[PDB]
Amino acid sequence: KVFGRCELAAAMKRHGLDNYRGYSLGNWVCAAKFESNFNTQATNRNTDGSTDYGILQINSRWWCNDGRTPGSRNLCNIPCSALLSSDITASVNCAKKIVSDGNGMNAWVAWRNRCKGTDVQAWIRGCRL
Ligand SMILES: [Cl-]
Ligand SMILES: [Cl-]
Ligand SMILES: [Cl-]
Numbered sequence: 001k002v003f004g005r006c007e008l009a010a011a012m013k014r015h016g017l018d019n020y021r022g023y024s025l026g027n028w029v030c031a032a033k034f035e036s037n038f039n040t041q042a043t044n045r046n047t048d049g050s051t052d053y054g055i056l057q058i059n060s061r062w063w064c065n066d067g068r069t070p071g072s073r074n075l076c077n078i079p080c081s082a083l084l085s086s087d088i089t090a091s092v093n094c095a096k097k098i099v100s101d102g103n104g105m106n107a108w109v110a111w112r113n114r115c116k117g118t119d120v121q122a123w124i125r126g127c128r129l
Contacts (some may be wrong), residue, residue: 001037001039001040001041002037002038002040003032003038003039003040003055005029005033005038005123005127006124006127006128006129007097008029008032008038008055008088009123009124009127009129010127010128010129011088012025012028012029012088012092013025013129014024015088015089015092015093016092016096017095017096020099021094021100021104022083023099023104023105024120024121025123025124025129026120026121026123026124027105027111027115027120027124028095029120029123029124030111030114030115030118030120030123031056031080031108031111031115031125032055032056033108033123034057034110034111034115035052035055035056035077035108035110035111036054036056036057037054038055038093039056040052040055040084040085040086040088040091041084042054042055042057043084044057046059046061048069049068049069050069050072051066051068051069051080053066053080053081053083053084054083054084054085054091055083055088055091056083056091056094056095056108057108057110058076058080058083058094058095058098060072060080060090061073062075062100063076063094063097064076064078064079064080064082064083064094065076065078065079065080066078066079066080066081075097076090076093076094076097078090078094086129087104099121121126
């Protein structure tokens with residue numbers, strides 16, 4: 001599924017991400033736009049052989065199992081394919097574990113480079129939330 005901006009904002013709000021660990025909703029929307037262009041089916045392979053999955057580009061070295069990333073952990077306890085669902089529940093629940101790990105949203109490279117320090121409230125402007 002390819003979300004619209006407000007539709008995704010609403011779904012993230014319903015699943016408890018607004019101000020989760022102090023990150024306002026626009027941060028989460030901005031990270032999804034630049035990680036996946038709001039496409040739940042997005043995959044991208046990394047140099048190390050790990051792959052990133054879904055709307056928040058969660059990495060199989062640490063967080064999920066894809067059966068092809070040797071020595072990797074599965075800290076969210078889920079197959080990586082779960083992260084590609086039209087239902088964002090599994091992505092959200094894993095993202096909450098990631099953002100709790102010590103480095104906050106700096107775990108997401110696109111957030112650090114494209115969202116951090118910007119007017120992220122713009123990403124939710126206009127939406128009925
Ligand atoms: Cl915001
Ligand atoms: Cl893994
Ligand atoms: Cl933080």
